[PDB]
Design a protein around this ligand. Structure first.
Ligand code: FMN
Ligand code: FMN
Lengths: 189, 188
């Protein structure tokens, strides 16, 4: 099929689950967050924010809270699959972009959210920065007991809830991207 | 900092005035291939990529969509589309409709957005103008012709309209939204 650098970036983008501790430069983090805000959104409502998190302590706390919520359910199956895969929710990533969203914008805010997270992932991949979408960061808020705390520490706008996150760093170990399923494309001529 | 992918992301805009010539199969296939390379929660891929080239199907969906707005007690949105030229699809000769599995609610909507943006960036990098079009869903809103359009489009059973991206070459161009740098913050 036809190829160009953007299409190569789309093709090569993969979910990294093993990061080195090396922090990406501010130069690169800025390019990535500038790319995110260029994401389109329904009615241009931009019912999101781009929070570039580099604080290790806050990251570890949200991770440990996330794991504990999972480890607290009656059905521990999910927490057990995670402990067998390495026991990390952020795979040693030294930073992440958290995308909170306005929940009173319902479904349209989630679509917009995904549009922006993909823009981040593609921008990071073009810059040689490994990444992964991580919905599990959301577990830090799930009990509701530490939700306001993490919200203020992250600087969420009032009323905003977690939407998604993208972890960023340099890959320690690689993975191929998912195989494209060509059977999901049809044509209505 | 700048590279081709970052320039595509910055220059992509929502075209609202398309030429009538059909992009080559070769370009359509490249956009469609990019789409299926979108990541999704748990690799669930609760979506499909349907490349719609049938003019009569688009014209009917467009008509049905407009009629829906026209029938609302609040004539506001109907009037907007009319001030924009009265074309719900701005003369696009083709579009990619993305149906989703609604029983996977929010996460499928997030995956829908990921995929539509993959389409928009792939299209833009190829010279193909595009626009996300949630109003394609207006063809289904009364529910009276949702089954019919779903069948005509080839939706998998149980699937519902997620989003769509209109494709074509631009008859006229318009600048993208001005990025609001204030939405970026850092937590050192
Ligand atoms: C919105 C979203 C959330 C995701 N959440 C997680 C997550 O919490 N943890 C994880 O390991 N992978 C997560 N994934 C990564 C997917 O598993 C991955 O994208 C999918 O398996 C396809 O593989 P690929 O990205 O390497 O092509 C998420 C992906 C998306 C799009
Ligand atoms: C998910 C989504 C759905 C959209 N739906 C429509 C639509 O139905 N009709 C339309 O004219 N524009 C639609 N828009 C276009 C937005 O107005 C546009 O993205 C926004 O104004 C930002 O402008 P830009 O794309 O030119 O930067 C949609 C955008 C997104 C992201």
């Amino acid at each position: 099929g036809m190829m160009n650098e953007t299409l190569k970036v789309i093709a090569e983008r993969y979910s990294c689950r093993d990061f080195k501790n090396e922090m990406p430069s501010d130069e690169l983090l800025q390019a990535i967050a500038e790319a995110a805000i260029q994401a389109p959104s329904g009615m241009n409502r931009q019912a999101w924010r781009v929070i570039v998190v580099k604080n290790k302590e806050l990251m570890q706390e949200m991770e440990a809270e996330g794991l504990a919520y999972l480890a607290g359910m009656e059905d521990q199956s999910s927490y057990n699959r995670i402990m067998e895969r390495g026991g990390r929710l952020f795979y040693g990533a030294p930073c992440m972009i958290v995308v909170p969203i306005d929940p009173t914008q319902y479904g349209p805010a989630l679509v917009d959210c995904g549009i922006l997270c993909q823009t981040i992932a593609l921008a990071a991949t073009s810059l040689g920065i490994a990444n992964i979408m991580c919905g599990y960061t959301g577990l830090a808020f799930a009990s509701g007991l530490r939700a306001e705390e993490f919200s203020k520490r992250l600087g969420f706008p009032e009323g905003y809830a977690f939407g998604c996150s993208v972890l960023l760093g340099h890959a320690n170990t690689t993975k191929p991207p998912h195989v494209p399923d060509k059977d999901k494309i049809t044509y209505v001529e």
